[PDB]
C-alpha cells in the first residue's frame, strides 16, 4: 500500500492545508567559506543588465563611470530584464500621480517630513542594526561605529558641539572638505589618511552572505552600509514613510486585509453588462539590480520642488551617495595542490596578481568586472542592494499601478517591496492580452521586470500577497517562526513569562488556536525545566538541585505555592498569559518561603517581572588573551564614567540627557548648585564646604592641566 500526505487537499482548501507545506521545524541552511562569487554575480549581473556601453570618465574617482539612464541599446531579447530608466516617462507618471489625489500633495507630505526632521536628535542613529566601521574595517553595532566616528572628528580637528541631525550631516560634509583625517589604529597608535582615500573609504559598503533565509536554493549576498549614509537614508525613509502612510495602494506600515476587501469590493461594483475581472499574482524579479538611484534623484528632485531650501538640498544627497558606492568583495579564495595537502589563501587584495589560478566561472565573472575593480573594492553605480531604500520603490510601484491611457478597461491593485497583486477589468480575452501587455509595457519602460515564471491569475479572488494565500472567502495566517518562543535565555525569572509574552503576542496578531497555545506553553515549560534542571517535587528526579528540595519539602506547608524554578506545578493557563508566575503565586506562599526568596539581601542579585532569581552568569575566558583586550579596558572606562554620571544626576535614565557643553562642567556646576541649595538650608560647616570646594578646585586644576 502506497501513501500520499497531499490527498487531504482533495476535499479541502489552501487556507487549511498550507501550513503543512512549510519546512519550518528544521534547521535553516547556512553559508560556508568566502562570499566573493556572490558579490561578483551581483555586480557583474548588474553591468550585464545595464544594457549599454556609454562610459563617461571621472575626475574625482580614478575609475570609469557607466551611465544608467536614457542610454539604451535595444536588444531583441526584451523579455530578459532591463535596467534602464526613462526619466520623462516616470516624471509623467508622477505628474499623473499627483493629479489623482489633491493638488499640494508633495508639499504637504514634505512639510510634515521636514517638520519631523528638525525635531530629531542624532542618538536615534544608535537605535539600529549593525553598521560598517571603516576605522578598523569591520562590522560593529551602531553606537560603537558612531562613537568611533565622533572620536575621529574630535581627534582630527576641533571638538563636536552639534547634538542635532543637520549639524551632524554638515559635519560630515565638512569632513569631506578636510584635506587630512587622523584616527586611531592598533596599543592605540594614531594614524592619518588623505583626502581622496577618505572619499574612497566613506562610501564603502560591506557585503556578506545572507544566513538563514527560508525559501531559496542558491545563497545571496546582503550588504551593510557605513555610518555616513545612515542619517540621509533615515531622512529619505521618513519622507517615503509619510508618502506611503498617506497613500491608499500600499501595504508596508500596516492593515493589509481591509485594503484588499475595499478594493475587491469597490472595484467589483464598477462593472458593466459584459465586463469582468481577472486578478494576477506576480513577483518582480531581480529587484535589487534594476532600481537605479538616478531616478530616485530625479523624483526626489520633483517631490521637493516647493518645500524649502534646506530640504531641497537635504533630500538630494543619499542618491548621490548611491551612484558612487564601493563594494567589498569578501576575503578572496583558496588554492591547493594536486594532492590536496597545502592550501594557500589569496585575499581580496592580491586577486589581480594571482588572476591565473582561478576557475572558468571565476575568470568569466572576473574579466567582466576587471575594468571596474579597485584594490579592495568595486565601483558599482546603479545598484540598490539589501539594507537600503525600501519604502521608496513601493512608490514607484504605486506609480505603475496608477497609469491612465485615455473601451473602459483598466487595472488597480496593491504593491509591496517586491510583491504585487494586479486586478484587471476588461471585456474579452485578447483585450486582456492587450491590457496585461500594456502593464508589462509600463513596468518594462519604468524599470520593473515581472517574472514570467512566478506569475499567474484567476477570475475571482484566489491571489497571493506576502505569504498569505487568500481564497474566495477565507484567510490563512502567516506561518510564523518556531524558535522565537524560546530566545530569552538570561535568567530563571525572565524566561517563562517572556515565553508567555511571545505566545500572547502571537495569539493576538496571528490566529494561534488555543490547543496550539496550550501545547506550546507546555513545551516551553518542558524546555524551561530541561534548561534549568528543575523538576516538580513529586517526580523521581534526583540531581544536585532536587536533593535539597526533596530534603526540605517538609518545611513548606502549602505545596502548590512554590515557584516553577523551585519545583512547583503549573498554574498559568491561556487566561493567565498576562500575569507572571510569581505575582499569581504570592497569594499562596508560606511566609518563611516568601520572606526568604524575596529578600533583597541576597548574594546573587546585589553587587518585566519581579527580580528575585536574577543572577548573572560568568564571562568568557578568551576575551583577555587576544589582541583586543584594551578595548574591553575601554568599555570598563566607559562604564566607570557612566557610573559617575549616574552618581551625579539621580534621575538620568528616565529622560534623554540632551545638552551640548560638556559632561564634567555640568557635574562640577551641579555639585556647586546642590552645594549652595543644600548649604543654606542644610549643611552649614566650614570644613565640609571648604573641603568639598578644595576637592572641586583641585580636580578642576587637575582636569584642565
Amino acid at each position: 500500500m502506497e501513501i500520499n500526505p497531499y490527498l487531504l487537499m482533495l476535499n479541502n482548501d489552501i487556507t487549511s492545508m498550507i501550513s503543512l507545506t512549510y519546512p519550518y521545524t528544521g534547521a535553516p541552511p547556512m553559508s560556508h567559506g568566502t562570499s566573493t562569487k556572490y558579490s561578483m554575480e551581483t555586480v557583474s549581473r548588474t553591468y550585464s543588465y545595464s544594457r549599454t556601453k556609454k562610459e563617461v570618465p571621472s575626475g574625482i574617482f580614478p575609475i570609469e563611470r557607466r551611465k544608467f539612464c536614457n542610454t539604451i541599446e535595444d536588444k531583441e531579447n526584451l523579455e530578459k530584464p532591463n535596467g534602464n530608466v526613462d526619466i520623462n516617462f516616470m516624471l509623467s507618471l508622477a505628474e499623473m500621480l499627483e493629479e489623482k489625489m489633491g493638488k499640494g500633495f508633495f508639499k504637504f507630505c514634505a512639510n510634515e517630513a521636514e517638520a519631523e526632521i528638525l525635531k530629531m536628535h542624532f542618538s536615534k542613529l544608535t537605535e539600529g542594526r549593525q553598521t560598517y566601521d571603516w576605522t578598523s574595517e569591520r562590522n560593529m553595532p551602531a553606537a560603537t561605529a558612531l562613537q568611533l566616528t565622533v572620536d575621529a572628528i574630535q581627534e582630527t580637528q576641533g571638538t563636536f558641539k552639534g547634538t542635532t541631525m543637520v549639524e551632524y550631516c554638515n559635519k560630515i560634509l565638512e569632513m569631506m572638505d578636510w584635506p587630512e583625517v587622523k584616527f586611531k589604529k592598533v596599543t592605540l597608535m594614531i594614524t592619518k589618511i588623505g583626502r581622496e582615500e577618505f572619499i574612497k573609504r566613506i562610501c564603502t559598503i560591506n557585503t556578506m552572505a545572507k544566513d538563514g533565509e527560508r525559501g531559496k536554493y542558491k545563497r545571496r549576498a546582503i550588504a551593510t552600509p557605513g555610518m555616513g549614509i545612515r542619517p540621509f537614508s533615515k531622512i529619505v525613509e521618513t519622507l517615503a514613510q509619510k508618502i506611503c502612510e498617506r497613500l491608499a495602494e500600499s501595504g508596508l506600515p500596516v492593515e493589509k486585509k481591509a485594503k484588499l476587501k475595499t478594493t475587491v469590493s469597490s472595484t467589483n461594483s464598477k462593472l458593466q453588462e459584459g465586463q469582468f475581472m481577472v486578478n494576477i499574482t506576480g513577483d518582480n524579479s531581480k529587484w535589487n539590480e534594476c532600481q537605479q538611484p538616478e531616478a530616485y534623484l530625479a523624483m526626489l528632485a520633483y517631490i521637493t520642488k516647493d518645500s524649502s531650501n534646506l530640504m531641497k538640498d537635504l533630500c538630494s544627497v543619499a542618491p548621490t551617495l548611491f551612484c558612487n558606492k564601493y563594494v567589498k568583495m569578501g576575503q578572496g579564495f583558496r588554492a591547493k595542490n594536486k594532492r590536496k595537502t597545502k592550501e594557500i589563501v589569496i585575499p581580496a587584495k592580491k586577486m589581480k596578481e594571482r588572476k591565473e589560478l582561478m576557475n572558468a566561472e571565476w575568470r568569466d565573472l572576473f574579466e567582466t568586472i576587471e575594468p571596474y575593480m579597485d584594490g579592495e573594492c568595486c565601483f558599482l553605480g546603479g545598484g540598490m542592494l539589501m539594507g537600503m531604500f525600501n519604502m521608496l520603490s513601493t512608490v514607484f510601484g504605486v506609480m505603475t499601478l496608477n497609469y491612465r491611457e485615455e473601451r473602459n478597461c483598466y487595472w488597480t491593485g496593491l504593491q509591496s517591496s517586491d510583491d504585487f497583486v494586479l486586478f484587471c477589468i476588461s471585456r474579452t480575452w485578447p483585450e486582456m492580452e492587450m491590457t496585461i501587455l500594456k502593464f508589462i509595457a509600463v513596468c518594462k519602460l519604468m524599470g520593473i521586470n515581472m517574472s514570467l515564471e512566478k506569475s499567474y491569475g484567476c477570475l475571482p479572488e484566489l491571489f497571493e500577497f506576502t505569504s498569505m494565500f487568500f481564497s474566495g472567502d477565507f484567510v490563512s495566517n502567516i506561518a510564523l517562526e518556531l524558535p522565537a518562543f524560546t530566545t530569552a535565555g538570561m535568567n530563571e525569572g525572565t524566561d517563562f513569562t517572556a515565553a508567555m509574552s511571545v505566545i500572547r503576542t502571537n495569539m493576538i496578531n496571528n490566529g494561534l488556536s488555543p490547543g496550539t497555545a496550550l501545547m506550546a506553553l507546555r513545551i516551553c515549560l518542558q524546555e524551561f525545566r530541561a534548561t534549568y534542571r528543575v523538576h516538580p517535587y513529586d517526580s523521581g528526579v534526583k540531581n544536585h538541585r532536587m536533593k535539597i528540595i526533596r530534603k526540605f519539602i517538609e518545611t513548606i506547608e502549602n505545596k502548590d505555592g512554590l515557584l516553577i524554578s523551585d519545583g512547583g506545578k503549573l498554574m498559568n493557563n491561556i487566561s493567565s498569559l498576562h500575569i507572571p508566575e510569581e505575582i499569581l503565586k504570592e497569594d499562596l506562599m508560606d511566609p518563611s518561603y516568601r520572606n526568604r526568596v524575596f529578600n533583597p539581601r541576597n548574594p546573587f542579585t546585589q553587587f518585566a517581572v519581579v527580580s528575585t532569581h536574577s543572577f548573572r552568569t560568568r564571562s568568557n575566558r578568551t576575551l583577555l588573551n587576544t589582541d583586543m583586550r584594551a578595548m574591553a579596558l575601554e568599555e570598563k572606562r566607559y562604564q566607570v564614567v557612566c557610573n559617575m554620571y549616574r552618581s551625579v544626576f539621580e534621575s538620568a535614565d528616565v529622560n534623554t540627557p540632551i545638552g551640548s557643553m560638556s559632561m564634567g562642567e555640568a557635574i562640577e556646576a551641579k555639585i556647586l548648585d546642590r552645594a549652595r541649595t543644600q548649604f543654606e538650608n542644610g549643611i552649614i560647616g566650614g570644613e565640609e564646604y571648604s573641603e568639598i570646594k578644595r576637592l572641586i578646585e583641585d580636580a578642576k586644576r587637575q582636569r584642565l592641566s
Partner: protein, 686 residues
C-alpha cells in the same frame, strides 16, 4: 577692534560673563554688545537699591548667568513661596511684589514690541519696554520709578550717542535653512546626473518646470509591439506534465541513526544511576558484551580491521568503567586527527619553477534516484508499537469554566495518540542522545568520549530505559557555528542488510538473541558520520514538532463549526473521514479514508521528517509545490487559471531536485496527486 570700542564704556566683569554667554549661544559678535546692554542695564536696575530688606534682597539678577540655572533657582523661589511660570523665563526676580519682571530694549516704537510680547503671553507676567530714542509703553502697574528710569534713559542716551559717534545702527540688531555647501560634494553631484543633463541646476529647473504630453502612449505602444509574449491557458493546452524524477542509482539511507532497523536492550531504570556514563556501565553489565564477538571480515563495507580494533578498544574501555579512548592508530584514523590542510597566509609563499602547481576546482553534488525503502518506514513510523509513553511531556494546568476544557480535551486526545508511536521513540532517541552529545561537546573539547544511544519509556508501568547503540565523539573544537565533528556510530540491528538501502554502512555480525513470541541472529552495524553545532541545537529540541500539527487538525475542526454554528467537536472527531494511502497497482479513485483523530499520527510523521531532511532542495521544492497547490485549487473550483512561461518554471523545479529522498518522494506523490486529481479535474496529463 570692537572689544576695545566696547571696553571704553562696557564693564570689566561683563566681558567675561557676557562673552561666556555668547560662548554658550554660539559664534557671534553683536550679541556681546546685546548682552552687554541688556545685562549692564539690569545691573543698573540692581545698583543702589535694597537699603533694608529680608535675608535675600528685593532684586534677584539671574538673566545674565550660566544658561542652566535660572530655571532651577526659579524653582527654588517659586517652589518656596508657591508660583508658576507661563512658558517664559524672567529677567529679574522680584519678591516684594510676588511677580516677575521682564525688560525689552528696542530701536522701534515701544507700542509694537509690547503688542508682540503681550500678544504672546498677555497679562500673565510683567513686561517693560524701553527704547534708545526715549519711548516707553509698558504694563499698567508701576513701582519706585523716576530714579532708575532717569539713569537708564541717561545710559541709553549715553550709548546711543556713542553709536551716533561711531555709526553702528544696523549692527545693533537683536535676534536655519542653510546646508553646508561643500566643494567635493558639488563636484560629485554634478558628475552623477543622468546623461541628457550637464549640472544639477538644469535638472532641478527642468524637474521644476515639467508638464507631461501624449508621446507617453506612443512610447508605450512602441514597447507593446516589440514584445512577442502570449499567455498560456489551461483548458485548451493543459501541459501540466509530471515532473522528471531522475532515473539513476537509488538514493541511500542518510539519517544519522537507525529508525526501522533498531534493536534495544532493556533494564529497569535506577534513579541514583542516571548519568549517561552510568547508564552505559549498567548496560555493560545488563547487555552482556562478553558475547559480543565480531569477526574481522565483514559482510560488506569499506574498512574492516579498524572498526574491529576500534570496537574491541571501546569494549575494553567500557569494561574498565571509564569513558576515554587512549590514543591508538584506529581512533587516529577514524576521527580526523591531523587531517587538515595547511592554511598558509599570503606573506610567505616561496614560489618554485613548475613545482607545487596549485589552483582550485569545485564540482557540485551528484544526482541519485527514487528511494524504494521510504514507504515502509513511513508506514512503520506511524504504526503503534508493549512500551507506552516515550516523549517527556509536562503536566496539565487547572481549568476554569472557559474554553480551556476544549483546549485541554484536544491536547489530551492528541497526546493519547502520539505517545505510543515509533516516531516518539525516534524523537526521544534524538533528544537524549544528541543532548548528551551536546553536553559532552561543551564540557570536553580535545578528548574523545563515549556517549550511549538510548531512550526511556514505561514498560507495564515500570519505568525502563533502552540502549540502541554506542556513539563516539571526535574532539569537537567548536569555534564557529560550523565545524562538523566526527561521530563514530556502532548500531544494533536484527535484520539482514541491503546494499541498496544501507549503502554507507559497514555491516558486521554480532551474534544471537533469544526472542520469545525463537533465537534469531544479531547484526552490528558501523558508520562514521559528522555533526555540527547548529544541528545539535536543532535536533535536541524536536519536541516543537508537536506545535504545528495540532494546529492543522484544529483548523479543520474549527472550520467545521465555522460552517455549522453548533458544538460538534467530540462526535466530529469520530464521524469524519480523511483520504490517505492509495494502493500501488491502482490509484484512480481507490483511496483509504481514516478517522479524523488517527490522521494526526500521519501528520506528526511529516513534521518529524521536516526536522530531518531539511536542505535547500526541500525549501525551493516547498515554494514550487505551493505554486502547484495554487494551480490545483484553481482547478478545483473551475476558475480557468493561466500561466505565462511554463518552460523555465519546470527548469526551476527540475533544477531544485537533486538528491534529497524526501524531495524525490514528495515529487513522486505530487505526480500521483496529479493522477488522482486528474481523474476528476481537467488540467493535467497521465
Amino acid at each position: 577692534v570692537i572689544r576695545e570700542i566696547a571696553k571704553r564704556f562696557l564693564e570689566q566683569a561683563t566681558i567675561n560673563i557676557a562673552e561666556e554667554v555668547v560662548r554658550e549661544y554660539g559664534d557671534h559678535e553683536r550679541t556681546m554688545i546685546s548682552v552687554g546692554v541688556h545685562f549692564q542695564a539690569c545691573c543698573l536696575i540692581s545698583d543702589e537699591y535694597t537699603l533694608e530688606d529680608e535675608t535675600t534682597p528685593r532684586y534677584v539678577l539671574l538673566e545674565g548667568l550660566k544658561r542652566q540655572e535660572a530655571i532651577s533657582k526659579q524653582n527654588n523661589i517659586c517652589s518656596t513661596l508657591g508660583l508658576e511660570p507661563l512658558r517664559n523665563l524672567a529677567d529679574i526676580f522680584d519678591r516684594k511684589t510676588r511677580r516677575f519682571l521682564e525688560v525689552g530694549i528696542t530701536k522701534r516704537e515701544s507700542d509694537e514690541y509690547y503688542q508682540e510680547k503681550f500678544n504672546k503671553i498677555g497679562n500673565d507676567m510683567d513686561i517693560h519696554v524701553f527704547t534708545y530714542e526715549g519711548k516707553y509703553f509698558s504694563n499698567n502697574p508701576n513701582g519706585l520709578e523716576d530714579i532708575q528710569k532717569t539713569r537708564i534713559f541717561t545710559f541709553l542716551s549715553f550709548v546711543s550717542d556713542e553709536l551716533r559717534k561711531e555709526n553702528m545702527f544696523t549692527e545693533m540688531y537683536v535676534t536655519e535653512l542653510e546646508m553646508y555647501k561643500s566643494k567635493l560634494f558639488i563636484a560629485m553631484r554634478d558628475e552623477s546626473v543622468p546623461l541628457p543633463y550637464i549640472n544639477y541646476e538644469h535638472l532641478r529647473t527642468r524637474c521644476e518646470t515639467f508638464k507631461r504630453n501624449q508621446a507617453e502612449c506612443e512610447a508605450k505602444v512602441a514597447d507593446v509591439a516589440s514584445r512577442l509574449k502570449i499567455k498560456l491557458e489551461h483548458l485548451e493546452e493543459n501541459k501540466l506534465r509530471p515532473l522528471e524524477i531522475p532515473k539513476e542509482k537509488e538514493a541511500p539511507y542518510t539519517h544519522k541513526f537507525l529508525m526501522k532497523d533498531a534493536w534495544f536492550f532493556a533494564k529497569p531504570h535506577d534513579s541514583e544511576r542516571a548519568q549517561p556514563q552510568q547508564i552505559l556501565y549498567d548496560f555493560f553489565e545488563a547487555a552482556n558484551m562478553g558475547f559480543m564477538t565480531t569477526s574481522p571480515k565483514p559482510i560488506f563495507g569499506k574498512q574492516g580491521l579498524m572498526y574491529h580494533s576500534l570496537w574491541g578498544q571501546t569494549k575494553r574501555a567500557i569494561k574498565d568503567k571509564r569513558n576515554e579512548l587512549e590514543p591508538s592508530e584506529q581512533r587516529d584514523f577514524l576521527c580526523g586527527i591531523g587531517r587538515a590542510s595547511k592554511k598558509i597566509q599570503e606573506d610567505k609563499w616561496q614560489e618554485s619553477r613548475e613545482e607545487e602547481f596549485k589552483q582550485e576546482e569545485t564540482k557540485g553534488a551528484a544526482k541519485r534516484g527514487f528511494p524504494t525503502w521510504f514507504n515502509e518506514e513511513w508506514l512503520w513510523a506511524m504504526r503503534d508499537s508493549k512500551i507506552g509513553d516515550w516523549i517527556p511531556m509536562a503536566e496539565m494546568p487547572p481549568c476554569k469554566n472557559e474554553m480551556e476544557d476544549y483546549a485541554k480535551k484536544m491536547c489530551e486526545e492528541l497526546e493519547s495518540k502520539i505517545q505510543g508511536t515509533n516516531c516518539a521513540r525516534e524523537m526521544s532517541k534524538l533528544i537524549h542522545t544528541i543532548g548528551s552529545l551536546h553536553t559532552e561537546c561543551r564540557n570536553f573539547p580535545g578528548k574523545v568520549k563515549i556517549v550511549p544511544i538510548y531512550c526511556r519509556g514505561t514498560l507495564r508501568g515500570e519505568s525502563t530505559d533502552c540502549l540502541f547503540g554506542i556513539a563516539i565523539k571526535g574532539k569537537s573544537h567548536l569555534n564557529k557555528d560550523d565545524g562538523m565533528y566526527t561521530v563514530v556510530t556502532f548500531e544494533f540491528s536484527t535484520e539482514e542488510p541491503n546494499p541498496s538501502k544501507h549503502e554507507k554502512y559497514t555491516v558486521f555480525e554480532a551474534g544471537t538473541v533469544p526472542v520469545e513470541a525463537k533465537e534469531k541472529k544479531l547484526f552490528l552495524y558501523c558508520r562514521t558520520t559528522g555533526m555540527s553545532k547548529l544541528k545539535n541545537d536543532w535536533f535536541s529540541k524536536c519536541r516543537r514538532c508537536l506545535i504545528p500539527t495540532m494546529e492543522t487538525v484544529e483548523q479543520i475542526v474549527l472550520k467545521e463549526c465555522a460552517l455549522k454554528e453548533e458544538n460538534r467537536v467530540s462526535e466530529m472527531l469520530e464521524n469524519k473521514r480523511a483520504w490517505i494511502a492509495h494502493e500501488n497497482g491502482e490509484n484512480l479513485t481507490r483511496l483509504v479514508s481514516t478517522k479524523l483523530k488517527d490522521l494526526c499520527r500521519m501528520l506528526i510523521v511529516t513534521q518529524f521528517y521536516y526536522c530531518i531532511y531539511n536542505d535547500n532542495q526541500l525549501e525551493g521544492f516547498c515554494n514550487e509545490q505551493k505554486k502547484f497547490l495554487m494551480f490545483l485549487q484553481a482547478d478545483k473550483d473551475s476558475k480557468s487559471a493561466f500561466t505565462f512561461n511554463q518552460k523555465g518554471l519546470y527548469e526551476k523545479i527540475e533544477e531544485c531536485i537533486v538528491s534529497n529522498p524526501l524531495c524525490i518522494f514528495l515529487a513522486d506523490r505530487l505526480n500521483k496527486l496529479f493522477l488522482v486529481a486528474k481523474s476528476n479535474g481537467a488540467k493535467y496529463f497521465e
